[PDB]
Design a protein around this ligand. Structure first.
Ligand SMILES: *[C@@H]1O[C@H](CO)[C@@H](O[C@@H]2O[C@H](CO)[C@@H](O[C@@H]3O[C@H](CO)[C@@H](O)[C@H](O)[C@@H]3O)[C@H](O)[C@H]2NC(C)=O)[C@H](O)[C@H]1NC(C)=O
Ligand SMILES: *[C@@H]1O[C@H](CO)[C@@H](O[C@@H]2O[C@H](CO)[C@@H](O[C@@H]3O[C@H](CO)[C@@H](O)[C@H](O)[C@@H]3O)[C@H](O)[C@H]2NC(C)=O)[C@H](O)[C@H]1NC(C)=O
Ligand SMILES: *[C@@H]1O[C@H](CO)[C@@H](O[C@@H]2O[C@H](CO)[C@@H](O)[C@H](O)[C@H]2NC(C)=O)[C@H](O)[C@H]1NC(C)=O
Ligand SMILES: *[C@@H]1O[C@H](CO)[C@@H](O[C@@H]2O[C@H](CO)[C@@H](O)[C@H](O)[C@H]2NC(C)=O)[C@H](O)[C@H]1NC(C)=O
Ligand SMILES: O=c1ccn([C@@H]2O[C@H](CO)[C@@H](O)[C@H]2O)c(=O)[nH]1
Ligand SMILES: O=c1ccn([C@@H]2O[C@H](CO)[C@@H](O)[C@H]2O)c(=O)[nH]1
Ligand SMILES: *[C@@H]1O[C@H](CO)[C@@H](O)[C@H](O)[C@H]1NC(C)=O
Ligand SMILES: *[C@@H]1O[C@H](CO)[C@@H](O)[C@H](O)[C@H]1NC(C)=O
Ligand SMILES: *[C@@H]1O[C@H](CO)[C@@H](O)[C@H](O)[C@H]1NC(C)=O
Ligand SMILES: *[C@@H]1O[C@H](CO)[C@@H](O)[C@H](O)[C@H]1NC(C)=O
Ligand SMILES: *[C@@H]1O[C@H](CO)[C@@H](O)[C@H](O)[C@H]1NC(C)=O
Ligand SMILES: *[C@@H]1O[C@H](CO)[C@@H](O)[C@H](O)[C@H]1NC(C)=O
Ligand SMILES: *[C@@H]1O[C@H](CO)[C@@H](O)[C@H](O)[C@H]1NC(C)=O
Ligand SMILES: *[C@@H]1O[C@H](CO)[C@@H](O)[C@H](O)[C@H]1NC(C)=O
Ligand SMILES: *[C@@H]1O[C@H](CO)[C@@H](O)[C@H](O)[C@H]1NC(C)=O
Ligand SMILES: *[C@@H]1O[C@H](CO)[C@@H](O)[C@H](O)[C@H]1NC(C)=O
Ligand SMILES: *[C@@H]1O[C@H](CO)[C@@H](O)[C@H](O)[C@H]1NC(C)=O
Ligand SMILES: *[C@@H]1O[C@H](CO)[C@@H](O)[C@H](O)[C@H]1NC(C)=O
Ligand SMILES: *[C@@H]1O[C@H](CO)[C@@H](O)[C@H](O)[C@H]1NC(C)=O
Ligand SMILES: *[C@@H]1O[C@H](CO)[C@@H](O)[C@H](O)[C@H]1NC(C)=O
Lengths: 748, 748
């Protein structure tokens, strides 16, 4: 669109995406209309006053991860960009803060460099700075120096709201912090003592992160240095006195054995309290601090286990009943054998508690009926226990994953129960009695070997999304699951166990019984043989995932029984036939795929040939995905066979000719993917649709191009249609002639 | 060696391997010294009198699978090959038996063609034939005709010993069979009735296969047509009267409900009796026929279950106690809930019974102590049941797999117990009491989540090979397995369950405790973090499989703890580091790999660079395997860094230059693999070792070669060293110049 950069005029403003394009310099061709410039992930080793001459409306520049193999920045290189507000210089191996940065700046990131010198000369004049990131310059077993913070360097930054200094060796909270601060990150900074003076004047603070100071190092997944004797962090009883607005407090991995309730005396708006990786089993049981937390919404007490201990029960203070605003409680990694109804009484009147997380506790037994007696649990998270039948992203949390506990597609339906990664290897007749009205149920990876027979889920009959992936279900009864009459989504992925055995029964008849089944995933089941009924049928099903089965055997030329296997899926729009070892598809089998299809995937098979003519029988087909096969040839008469195709994905095949004509009157085609094929060239005509083109994406990288003078018309075409995104254009590489043998088009 | 063919002068005789070389004709360059010629798997569409002009010492020709896309053979094409004994013409889409075949023939195979016409004109003069294969010409839902066998066609073949007509539509045993027959195959031939006359004169017969006539079709994994009403095959009571020498009788899938004991009256040397896929639950219980089988060594009664039945116990006739020669009993697929000691009393005095196979019965409970009371069980096969804590190869068996029940590497150690693919999800304290002295134990795929602690295998303390693959073991105790003091082979593959979780313990210390541990497989465990001890140690271990773990994280530049992870494996010769997502290996980590290594695999990683200089620290290194990485460059000074390397595998990398010099003084190098790289050319010098070369294999296929006149010296070199196998030479393909763009070298 603006080589070597794209642009988006989106919408008030103008972004030049010049990312990951192995540039060796800032390109001088950037349009002076651009406001934001992304130069990240290139090979840039120098920035000078020449670099942005040039581009006086620039308000943001992202130089992260250059050269991605440090970056050498001249004094005052940016100094004449009057409008520059945001400057990202992460992971550039910088040995110092660049000198002569512009006073315009409001955001500066210097995360993941080699800076151990924070000087007034560097930053004290940047008086418009709001956010300053200096995290991850010295940590673990990196070779590096303690951070030298010149006294009062930050004091003149009277607009500073965010300061991040985590993952650096500091030893003390810096003094003379501006009272504008709202968020102060000091994790893993080797700070053993927090004095009364350290945060005294910071009355605007809403976040304080002191995690990983005096860390808990047992079983640490990184190089970990504890305080002497694995001692607790030492926090003066008044250290938080003035922090009246505090909303987030992270004390994870500070080796706490005791929580000074007084810490929260003046902090009545605290909403999120993170106490993972301490030694708090005692405090969880007794727990004065728990009376001081009236507005607390999220409490994380995960991984406080005593090593080698495996108590029968979890011991929860009555004082949990004081957590009236609590929405989510995380108690992973306490480690205990049995959860009884009594043990959680202090939680049962908390009006807003919607999520309980007891993952990873090695729990053997649960009194399931206790959950009903909560006021309004929405998410009951029991994944990764022992229940049986009745390297680091600097912009992420370091102590826990932040992905939803339950997939949003499943939780959307209603109350959720996650029993994955346990040992519920069959479901007895009372397994789900006394539960709430579960809508979303996860029994993935229970090595369940049951003959489901239409009774097993009768006590939670309203499940709508059921995840049964990674079990070993035995399909010997045609009434399986049929008691779930409102079932919409059924994941049977990775249940190959019994499908792989010819000699036992495989009954999938049950599929047809559901009036509202929409999405079925039969992936990675190794299905090659069925009992009695060879046809799948449903008046409702939208999407069928059949990848990683054996259609190569089901559609074997000497066997006619499966030739209409999917035809009875009369509503189907989406079908995934990937990874079925197919070398060809019998024409009759293809013509019996449902005519309702809008999306068909046959990627990662071994197809030599595709019968294009048969697309005439699929007038609703919008996406066809044939990536990763062995195809040599495309039809020259595509518009004779489809008027509907919008996306055609043909990467990783053996296509050496692209017929002039291919284009013709195709019109619906938005997205054509020809990357990773055997293409020496591309003719003009092969694109120039004499109707209207919807062409907006055309992929070509990984073809052995030839950059003889003509050209082709291709380059001319490219400019004739600057609005056709062609990603990875730098990866479209002349393999010839030899004056180009590793060059990107174009350059003459 | 003899383009386009190899040759082996091995040893009295001379084999020309011209297989799978996409030939379009029989090459006229075959040396008249050749005795056996393999032309299988090519694109040959014609055979004429010209084809073997030429080659008068030919005794064997294999033309199977031509053209592999039928084959058109002229009358008498082979007629002048006086010494021709064996002719394989399988899978050639032949519409008839070729005419004018030579009388010299002793073996003729015509399996998998379109022959429905067996005529005197075709074969009656082939009076030297011993073995005649005509199987698989008409079967399943192939479009084909009933087989017309001209009356008395076989009668003149008075040397015929083997006749195979299986998988053809016959309806009746052919009459006028020669009394020379020893083996008669008639499986799946649509023969409903066996009369007294059918085998009357066949006194030399030792094998008769009548399987799949009136088949059991429930749950059939192929198109199956039963006799009317699913009726039994009808075998006249005297049909086997004269078959006194019979050794093998296959009656699998003949819908038998009743076994006429009289069938075996005159057949006292029967050794193998196959009765799979019938309806014999009644006969197994009552069983007169069982008294008639004194020399029987293998009995197969698998898959006789009654559909939908799930009896509590298996019912075995007392008459099994008459099977005095029995060595192996196969009772898969009976389907029953519990095996009690009583139920197998009739087996317990059989002196030679070494294998009991009860796979695939969905058994829930076993009285394990019953096995001890057998005389000398060697293999106790219980795989694929429900036990819980206390398309078709025409040359293979069609009704069961013929691979060993136990891997020979494990069974070699002694008595074997296979409990794989059950639900023994923990091992209680008495689980293995009252067993024989087990040496080989398979607990693979029991979803076992146990903390092994050094007591669990105490009642079978002599296990030497333990297969624990595909479980979810929790390594929380450093004494795991240590009670097995003689343990030699330990397979922990596919136990990623708990390794993937950072926050729980992973203790592999136990490895060091074993005095005789030789082979350890830790593949596909996703190992990225260990507890307390970061080093693996053993004075004995020979082989460590560490593929599919996360060495990319273990050897992260900011973490020093795993930099000597394998160093303490002081005896190690073989190490597999494949599939660990490695982009580079820190030099220190490489130099700390044990100096004892003779074989190192680092294939299927993402390496851009390899430090060749560090091979100086591995003076015993014989094999180095770097396939499937991103390497661009080879060292020009290999002999400076190793004098030991014998095999170097470098396929699927990005190597475009092969330094002249690479060769130099390398001498130990037998096998060089450069296939699937980016090589435009290969210089002469790059090979011509001025010391002695051990070069015997050099792979090059899948490189973009250039076939400009010079040449190189390469082609000259090739002939200068005709004894260097270069497999897939036809796949070494000129990508240039354009007069060659898809040609194989060489051709000018
Ligand atoms: C078995 O198949 C189902 C159906 O394909 C899989 O769930 C589906 O996963 C896709 C791929 O992630 C989800 O699509 C994504 O949704 C997000 C959020 O809306 C969107 O941002 C992405 O661009 C993408 O569209 C799809 O919603 C989801 N469907 C359902 C019903 O949950 C499932 O993951 C497969 N199971 C396994 C074990 O592979
Ligand atoms: C875990 O690793 C072990 C050790 O590599 C695997 O067993 C080993 O498998 C190899 C590959 O098949 C066996 O080598 C083969 O032996 C046969 C018969 O002697 C030979 O003909 C072949 O050319 C080849 O050498 C090797 O014997 C065997 N080792 C042992 C101790 O059994 C094992 O399969 C791996 N487990 C999984 C689940 O992948
Ligand atoms: C059911 O639980 C399983 C296991 O906890 C979930 O599987 C994980 O899904 C996440 C998010 O997609 C993946 O990144 C993980 O790799 C999966 N983990 C494993 C162990 O397979 C699954 O998503 C849960 N189902 C629902 C509906 O929430
Ligand atoms: C333990 O049992 C497992 C399962 O029966 C065996 O695994 C099979 O091994 C065969 C022969 O290598 C493979 O072709 C199969 O794919 C494997 N099956 C499965 C389900 O994984 C294993 O070989 C047995 N171990 C020993 C020592 O005999
Ligand atoms: O089955 C169990 C039970 C308890 N623990 C404990 O859980 C903690 C984390 O692994 C350790 O202290 C360990 O003793 C386990 O690891 N596995
Ligand atoms: O768990 C069980 C028990 C029995 N069967 C029976 O085994 C035979 C083969 O699948 C069928 O008759 C079926 O009823 C099973 O499939 N699963
Ligand atoms: C950059 O600075 C040099 C002097 O060091 C000057 O000669 C040159 O014109 C400057 N370039 C721009 C674009 O200002
Ligand atoms: C940085 O670059 C300048 C010129 O662009 C050069 O003179 C200087 O040596 C470089 N500094 C470092 C520390 O590499
Ligand atoms: C710190 O930076 C200052 C100010 O730019 C510089 O003068 C000094 O040399 C630096 N000191 C160290 C130790 O890097
Ligand atoms: C607190 O914050 C605001 C800006 O959000 C600032 O203007 C005000 O002066 C601050 N007060 C103190 C005491 O720092
Ligand atoms: C399925 O199981 C139910 C419950 O045991 C049983 O009653 C029914 O007969 C079974 N078979 C079929 C085909 O539905
Ligand atoms: C058919 O599929 C569509 C999506 O294409 C879905 O909206 C509708 O609910 C399904 N129809 C039926 C009858 O279930
Ligand atoms: C495509 O299939 C049609 C109908 O099955 C058939 O007539 C035609 O020959 C096939 N085309 C190719 C190119 O094989
Ligand atoms: C093959 O037969 C033809 C006659 O059909 C004859 O002219 C020719 O010489 C023969 N070739 C050989 C090698 O015998
Ligand atoms: C077989 O080949 C001969 C000549 O080589 C040709 O004349 C004849 O038509 C072919 N026969 C068939 C059935 O294709
Ligand atoms: C069978 O082969 C004979 C002898 O070669 C031939 O004459 C006849 O045409 C063939 N009959 C059929 C039905 O193919
Ligand atoms: C049986 O077999 C031998 C060859 O093995 C043959 O010579 C002998 O004549 C045969 N006897 C009969 C009765 O066919
Ligand atoms: C391992 O388990 C055994 C048996 O319970 C126990 O006695 C021992 O103390 C455990 N721990 C270690 C480190 O061996
Ligand atoms: C060391 O390895 C070899 C194979 O290299 C093996 O023969 C020997 O038993 C092992 N040594 C010890 C001490 O276990
Ligand atoms: C190979 O490693 C050695 C020793 O660690 C080091 O001196 C040398 O620079 C490395 N070689 C390359 C080519 O990086």
């Amino acid at each position: 669109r603006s080589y070597p950069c794209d642009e988006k005029k989106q919408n008030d403003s103008v972004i030049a995406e010049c990312s990951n394009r192995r540039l060796q310099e800032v390109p001088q061709t950037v349009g002076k209309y651009v406001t934001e410039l992304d130069l990240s992930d290139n090979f840039i080793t120098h920035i000078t006053n020449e670099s942005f001459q040039g581009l006086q409306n620039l308000t943001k520049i992202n130089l992260n991860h250059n050269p991605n193999v440090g970056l050498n920045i001249t004094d005052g290189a940016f100094l004449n960009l009057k409008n520059l507000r945001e400057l990202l210089l992460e992971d550039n191996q910088l040995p110092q803060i660049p000198s002569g940065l512009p006073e315009s700046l409001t955001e500066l990131s210097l995360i993941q460099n080699n800076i151990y010198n924070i000087t007034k000369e560097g930053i004290s004049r940047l008086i418009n700075l709001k956010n300053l990131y200096l995290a991850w310059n010295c940590y673990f077993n990196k070779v590096c120096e303690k951070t030298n913070i010149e006294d009062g360097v930050f004091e003149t930054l009277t607009n500073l709201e965010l300061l991040s200094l985590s993952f650096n060796s500091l030893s003390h909270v810096p003094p003379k912090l501006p009272s504008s601060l709202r968020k102060l990150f000091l994790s893993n900074t080797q700070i053993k003592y927090i004095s009364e003076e350290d945060f005294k004047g910071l009355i605007n603070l809403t976040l304080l992160d002191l995690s990983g100071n005096c860390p808990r190092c047992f079983n640490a997944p990184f190089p970990c240095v504890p305080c002497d004797g694995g001692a607790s962090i030492n926090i003066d009883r008044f250290a938080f006195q003035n922090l009246t607005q505090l909303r987030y407090l992270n004390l994870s991995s500070t080796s706490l054995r005791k929580i000074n309730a007084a810490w929260f005396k003046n902090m009545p708006h605290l909403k999120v309290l993170d106490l993972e990786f301490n030694y708090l089993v005692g405090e969880i049981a007794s727990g004065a601090f728990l009376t001081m937390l009236p507005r607390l919404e999220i409490l994380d007490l995960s991984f406080n286990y005593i090593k080698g201990s495996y108590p029968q029960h979890i011991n929860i203070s009555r004082n949990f009943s004081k957590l009236l605003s609590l929405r989510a409680l995380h108690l992973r990694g306490y480690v205990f054998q049995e959860l009884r109804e009594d043990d959680f009484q202090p939680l049962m009147q908390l009006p807003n508690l919607s999520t309980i997380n007891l993952g990873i506790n090695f729990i053997k037994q649960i009194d399931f009926k206790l959950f009903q007696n909560f006021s309004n649990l929405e998410i009951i998270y029991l994944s990764e226990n022992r229940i049986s039948p009745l390297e680091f992203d600097p912009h992420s949390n370091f102590y826990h994953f932040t992905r939803p506990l339950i997939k949003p597609q499943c939780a959307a339906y209603g109350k959720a129960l996650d029993l994955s990664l346990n040992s519920i290897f069959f479901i007895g007749p009372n397994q789900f009695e006394n539960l709430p009205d579960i809508a979303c149920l996860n029994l993935s990876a229970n090595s369940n070997a049951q003959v489901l027979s239409g009774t097993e889920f009768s006590a939670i009959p309203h499940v709508k999304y059921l995840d049964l992936t990674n079990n070993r279900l035995d399909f010997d009864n045609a009434s399986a699951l049929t008691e779930l009459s409102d079932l919409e989504v059924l994941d049977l992925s990775y249940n190959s166990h019994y499908f792989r055995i010819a000699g036992v029964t495989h009954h999938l008849e049950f599929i047809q019984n559901f009036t509202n089944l929409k999405v079925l995933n039969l992936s990675h089941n190794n299905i090659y043989t069925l009992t009695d009924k060879y046809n799948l049928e449903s008046k409702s099903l939208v999407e069928l995932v059949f990848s990683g089965n054996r259609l190569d055997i089901l559609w074997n030329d000497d066997d006619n029984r499966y030739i209409s296997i999917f035809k009875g899926l009369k509503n189907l729009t989406r079908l995934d036939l990937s990874l079925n070892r197919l070398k060809h598809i019998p024409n009759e089998a293809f013509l019996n795929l449902p005519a309702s299809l809008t999306e068909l995937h046959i990627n990662d098979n071994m197809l030599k040939f595709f019968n294009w003519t048969l697309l005439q029988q699929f007038p609703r087909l919008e996406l066809l995905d044939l990536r990763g096969n062995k195809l040599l040839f495309l039809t020259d008469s595509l518009s004779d066979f489809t008027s509907s195709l919008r996306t055609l994905l043909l990467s990783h095949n053996r296509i050496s000719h692209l017929p002039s004509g291919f284009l013709s009157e195709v019109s619906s085609l938005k997205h054509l993917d020809l990357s990773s094929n055997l293409l020496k060239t591309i003719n003009k005509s092969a694109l120039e649709t004499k109707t209207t083109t919807k062409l907006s994406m055309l992929e070509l990288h990984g073809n052995p191009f030839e950059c003889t003078c003509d050209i082709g018309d291709f380059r001319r075409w490219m400019d004739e249609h600057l609005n056709v995104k062609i990603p990875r254009l730098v990866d479209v590489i002349c393999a010839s002639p030899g004056d180009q043998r590793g060059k990107s088009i174009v350059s003459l």
